[PDB]
Design a protein around this nucleic acid. Structure first.
Ligand SMILES: [Mg+2]
Ligand SMILES: [Mg+2]
Ligand SMILES: [Mg+2]
Ligand SMILES: [Mg+2]
Ligand code: NA
Lengths: 220, 119, 124, 142
RNA sequence: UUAGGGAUAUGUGGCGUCAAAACUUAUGGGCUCAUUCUCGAUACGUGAAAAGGGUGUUGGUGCACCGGCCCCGAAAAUGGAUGACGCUUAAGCCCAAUUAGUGAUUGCCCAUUAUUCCUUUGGUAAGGGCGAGAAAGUGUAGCCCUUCCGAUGUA
RNA sequence: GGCCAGAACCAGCCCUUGCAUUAUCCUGUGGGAAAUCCGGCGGGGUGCAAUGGUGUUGGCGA
RNA sequence: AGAAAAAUCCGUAAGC
RNA sequence: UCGAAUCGCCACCUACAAGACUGGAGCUUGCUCGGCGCCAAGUAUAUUCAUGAUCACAAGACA
């Protein structure tokens, strides 16, 4: 929430609304560790990144193996005062953020700035839905990283079985969002077809040598 | 999907002979094949890995059989060959040609806008 | 009756890079050489093209000090500043560069920030 | 032939008079001009827009701040442009300078018009060069 | 193996992030799935024996044995350690390359080491001289100029 | 201001096919259609060489 | 400078 | 106060799923038949650019 001084400065200056350059990554069907390493290096290089759909990351192996690994992690606590001990976060976005934090140099101001440059969500929230197209990391995708015969696990199911009470909430919100987007995209089909037809028809009216150059370069 | 078989036409993906078309003349093993093409000067008989080929939809069944099949003409006619030639054209281009392409695209966009408004 | 936005402002004329750090090993860094990563340059053959070019690193200070054309063109006076350098050689297989700044080192406060790489100083 | 002779030169072969160059620095960065001559004693180049195409007058430019492209225009003009026209004593333009610019621009426009592809070359001289997000000048040829 | 500093190239060790280097290289071949200390994974050095089984192979022949990897055999006291995260079309293990059957040569990263350049200091030192400048000289603000070699260190 | 910058030139330094061997080879003319393979006869791709200077153009400085 | 916000009225990313 | 660093934008991207998967058929089961944007609102007939004097933060902006 902005302060009244910040609002007054903005009003007095009169400049228009500003948004910095932010990359939004759709993390569905990505390998957790490879995605974390790539994102950590980009954060250190100076990018602002927002990751969505953190509950559909992938890990290799069976859910039972990965759940046993998490329980072993959860067993560690400072015996003398557990309120100081390690804090075990159960949500998939917190799991991703902790993996990245362990891949960063966290006890330095530079590493702290890098870690604060990252935002993580489950699903796609309304303040992110309409900001532009999402990206993928092609060198960290499951269909090219795992052999197809081997089993794998989805982060949401494992996190649900170790804690994380909000799986059903996220599922309902995602279903509603996809329904709304599907309705909107079913609309505008006529407009898209009209623009495609206009593009096809303009060739008959533009100059012939321009058409020839387009055909030569393959934009025909 | 297109199968790997004797006489099948393939395109090379990477390497010094990339974006070239040849014919499979012998299956050495699960990973390697022998490729030749009399038409191309650089495509004499050699060994290629199967990670470096893309099968096409033509299979002759050597120079006489290839000429009779006329798969080279069909490949020249399809849209992939057009894309490859356009990529080579874009690669070898000058500032003047880039300017000409820019004005052609701007002309097409303007006329598309006019047609859309008219309709 | 259909309009589009057309970009007809001043042109850019440089490439956008980012400082990455200094040369170093497992024992520490040597601050007299800096590593720069430039956009769309991703091979050693690409990074060879940029050897000899000139790099800038613009920033700002707190007070208005002297600039190049202080007396003529008093419209240039500002808190903005710059620190020039030059590219010396590639740094690996993936298109990094080693740059050398004029007479001193680039400050470490610039480590994650933007660097301008110009096309001129060795035109061709 | 002699090293200190006034006719000595070293300038590369792409900056031949009549070529079209992209200005990389200065007030007219991004504009395209025509290379007219090289001043003696291995000196700067001389460019003209011509004005009314891009607004570049007769000016001096070092060859290190120009990309000489492969597109040229055949020019046969008188070229009475020494270094004294640019040297000066220790909106405002002298009569000699304005007259020289007028004559040279007239000859240049006549030559460009006479050349085939002349309309395309005039548009080419009117256009502006910029570096966009997503393109690699190190992979092109000019 | 060590005078005060640049540039170039290496040794041991490495090239997913921490952390410089394959922005996760290859247009190389095989093998392996590991459910609560436990799949592996930098020697020296800090994790194990008899016996028994799964997946890929090898002698023999008309079934027996005999090796690669993995599993069982394998049980302690604060919560914890291939360094951490993590990795399985490896970022694991055994071999092999350097941009790949296209045709001569070195993929790249990092030293108080090697080569080279500048400056100091000392010699079992080696030569020359006697418009501002020169003293027949162990040691100075060194009489002046050139040259080569060494330079760490407790009692 | 040799205070700060740019370009140019000298010197030095760093980088950037030939001839030998070509044969367990190449090429025509019983076995498993053809090919892979085995006996008869005839014709023929890897070891060396090829920092120091000497002015010029701006900025700041009345 | 980054919202698990929004995109005559009210009610419908519709007809409204 | 405040001058500052940042230099693509859009009611055509800003919906979705699968890689042993990709338009439709046939049986013969492997054969056959993003868009714009980069200097005339648009590819032509035009039109102001200096002296900001040969590099210097782009002396310019928030399409
Ligand atoms: Mg020792
Ligand atoms: Mg690194
Ligand atoms: Mg001593
Ligand atoms: Mg002592
Ligand atoms: Na280690």
């Amino acid at each position: 929430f902005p302060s009244r001084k910040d609002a007054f400065r903005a009003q007095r200056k009169g400049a228009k609304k500003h948004r910095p350059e932010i990359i939004v990554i759709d993390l569905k069907d990505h390998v957790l560790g490879r995605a974390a390493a790539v994102v950590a290096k980009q954060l250190l290089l100076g990018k602002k990144i927002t990751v969505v759909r953190c509950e559909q990351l992938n890990i290799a192996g069976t859910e039972i193996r990965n759940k046993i690994k998490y329980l072993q992690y959860l067993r560690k606590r400072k015996l003398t005062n557990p309120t100081k001990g390690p804090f075990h976060h159960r949500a998939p976005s917190d799991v991703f953020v902790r993996t990245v934090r362990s891949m960063l140099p966290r006890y330095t101001k530079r590493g702290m700035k890098a870690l604060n440059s990252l935002v993580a969500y489950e699903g796609i929230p309304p303040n992110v839905v309409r900001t532009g197209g999402r990206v993928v990391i092609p060198r960290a995708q499951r269909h090219v990283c795992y052999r197809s015969e081997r089993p794998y696990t989805v982060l949401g199911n494992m996190c649900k079985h170790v804690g994380w009470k909000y799986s059903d909430v996220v599922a309902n919100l995602e279903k509603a969002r996809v329904e709304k987007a599907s309705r909107h995209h079913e609309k505008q089909a006529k407009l898209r077809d009209a623009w495609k037809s206009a593009r096809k028809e303009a060739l008959a009216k533009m100059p012939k040598h321009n058409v020839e150059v387009l055909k030569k370069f393959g934009y025909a | 999907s297109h199968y790997i078989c004797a006489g099948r036409l393939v395109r090379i993906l990477r390497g010094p002979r990339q974006d070239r078309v040849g014919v499979i003349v012998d299956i050495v093993d699960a990973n390697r094949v022998l490729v030749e093409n009399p038409e191309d000067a650089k495509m004499w008989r050699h060994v290629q890995n199967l990670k470096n080929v893309e099968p096409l939809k033509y299979c002759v069944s050597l120079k006489d059989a290839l000429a009779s099949s006329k798969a080279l003409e069909k490949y020249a006619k399809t849209r992939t060959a057009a894309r490859v030639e356009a990529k080579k054209a874009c690669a070898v281009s000058t500032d003047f040609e880039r300017y000409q392409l820019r004005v052609a695209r701007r002309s097409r966009a303007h006329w598309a806008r006019k047609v859309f408004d008219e309709k | 009756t259909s309009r589009v936005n057309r970009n007809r402002k001043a042109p850019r004329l440089y490439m956008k890079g980012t400082l990455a750090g200094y040369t170093r090993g497992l024992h520490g860094q040597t601050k007299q050489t800096a590593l720069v990563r430039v956009e769309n340059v991703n091979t050693r053959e690409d990074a060879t093209w940029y050897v000899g070019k000139r790099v800038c690193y613009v920033y700002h200070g707190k007070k208005v000090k002297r600039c190049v054309r202080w007396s003529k063109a008093p419209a240039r006076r500002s808190t903005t500043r710059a620190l020039w350098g030059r590219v010396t050689r590639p740094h690996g297989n993936a298109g990094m560069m080693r740059v050398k700044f004029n007479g001193a080192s680039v400050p470490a406060s610039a480590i994650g920030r933007r660097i301008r790489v110009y096309l001129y100083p060795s035109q061709i | 032939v002699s090293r200190k002779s006034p006719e000595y030169t070293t300038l590369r072969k792409s900056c031949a008079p009549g070529a079209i160059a992209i200005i990389l620095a200065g007030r007219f960065r991004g504009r395209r001009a025509v290379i007219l001559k090289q001043l003696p004693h291995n000196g700067p180049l001389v460019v003209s827009g011509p004005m009314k195409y891009n607004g570049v007058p007769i000016r001096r430019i070092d060859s290190r701040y120009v990309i000489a492209t492969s597109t040229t225009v055949d020019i046969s003009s008188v070229d009475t442009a020494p270094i004294t026209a640019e040297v000066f004593q220790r909106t405002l333009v002298s009569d000699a300078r304005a007259q020289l610019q007028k004559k040279i621009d007239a000859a240049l426009i006549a030559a460009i018009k006479k050349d085939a592809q002349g309309k395309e070359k005039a548009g080419y001289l009117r256009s502006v060069f910029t570096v966009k997000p997503g393109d690699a000048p190190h992979r092109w040829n000019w």
